[PDB]
Design a protein around this ligand. Structure first.
Ligand SMILES: COc1ccc(-n2cnc3ccc(-c4n[nH]c(=S)o4)cc32)cc1
Ligand SMILES: Cc1cccc(C#N)c1
Length: 341
């Protein structure tokens, strides 16, 4: 197998290029995100992923800019970046599995993903959002394919930052963004000036999907997506519109569908309770990521005796930086339990 030696800049150092040799290069994804490869680093033995994303020659990549600004255990780490045939190559932590494949295995086996795995996976998604959100970075593509899992350690790493943007207060962004099923209604309603909270809607969609075993708003066109969200939440008050986008569309007033009525009869109430505080027609209603962590739902994860279904200890959950504890710093007592402090 070809040993490839590139010249690569570290992610977190100064711009200080190294010869980096990798091998066992296979391609494991190839799509709208470009090409993702698997590789083994020759000297460490460590597995890595390598996203090869299109670059002009003199057009400034935003993903890379953002990529080096981040160091969170629930975000996939940019180990190196380098160039080839011009293409930007991002050498990443390898993470074997995605929530999308996991969710589907269950779905296909007419089985629901154990609520505890929903607790962990959501928790780490919500921490990672509380992370990138403190920097005002909206991921803008939160969907099951974009949360990577290690199934053995239960670690979730949020990935693919190819749509993330440093959201500027008072500035216009595209409204046709995110994957249809996960796209907030403001986005649907052509809003060009949206908060980072669209992520948190997207996340609520992931959570509800994990509980329902199917997407919750599976529309079969951009327009139809509204029809799916109404089926559940109801017609948004014209007020609720004002609070989504000021300005379109034409709709009659369909009734809301109660929250307990949406989820299969045995779902924990703290789970349903949460969605209601995520899937809000109102962005300013959607809980901040950091608030979402403090939620009753993730209290089993605040148990000192908590274990994985394979006997093991949970991954890092309480290593909050003060950078992270900045949306609402008075949340440590009900975020950091009395054992990791
Ligand atoms: C076919 O299923 C899989 C394909 C690839 C991966 N994969 C493994 N380690 C990874 C690290 C980073 C990324 C990634 N970040 N942004 C984009 S786009 O891809 C993907 C990774 C997992 C499962
Ligand atoms: C966007 C995305 C997520 C997860 C895996 C891949 C690949 N290959 C791409």
């Amino acid at each position: 197998s070809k040993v490839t030696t590139v010249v690569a800049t570290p992610g977190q150092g100064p711009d200080r290029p190294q010869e980096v040799s990798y091998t066992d290069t296979k391609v494991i994804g190839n799509g709208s995100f470009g090409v993702v490869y698997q590789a083994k680093l020759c000297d460490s033995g460590e597995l890595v992923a390598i996203k090869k994303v299109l670059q002009d020659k003199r057009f400034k990549n935003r993903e890379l800019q953002i990529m080096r600004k981040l160091d969170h255990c629930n975000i996939v780490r940019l180990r190196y970046f380098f160039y080839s045939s011009v293409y930007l190559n991002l050498v990443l932590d390898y993470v074997p599995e995605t929530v999308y494949r996991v969710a589907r295995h269950y779905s296909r086996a007419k089985q629901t993903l154990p609520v505890i795995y929903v607790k962990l996976y959501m928790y780490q998604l919500f921490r990672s959002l509380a992370y990138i959100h403190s920097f005002g970075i909206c991921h803008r593509d939160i969907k099951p394919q974009n949360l990577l899992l290690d199934p053995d350690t239960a670690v979730l790493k949020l990935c693919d930052f190819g749509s993330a943007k440093q959201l500027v207060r008072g500035e216009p962004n595209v409204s046709y963004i995110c994957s249809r099923y996960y796209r907030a209604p403001e986005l649907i309603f052509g809003a060009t000036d949206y908060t980072s909270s669209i992520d948190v809607w997207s996340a609520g969609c992931v959570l509800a999907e994990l509980l329902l075993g199917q997407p919750i708003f599976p529309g079969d066109s951009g327009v139809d997506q509204l029809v799916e969200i109404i089926k559940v939440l109801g017609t948004p008050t014209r007020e609720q519109i004002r609070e989504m986008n000021p300005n379109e569309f034409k709709f009659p007033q369909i009734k809301a569908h109660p929250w307990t009525k949406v989820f299969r009869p045995r779902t924990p109430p703290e789970a349903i309770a949460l969605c209601s505080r995520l899937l809000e027609y109102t962005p300013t209603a959607r809980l901040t990521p950091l608030e979402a962590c403090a939620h009753s739902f993730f209290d089993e994860l605040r148990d000192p005796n908590v274990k994985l279904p394979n006997g093991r200890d949970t991954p890092a959950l309480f290593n909050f930086t003060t950078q992270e504890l900045s949306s609402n710093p008075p949340l440590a007592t009900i975020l950091i339990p009395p054992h990791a402090r």
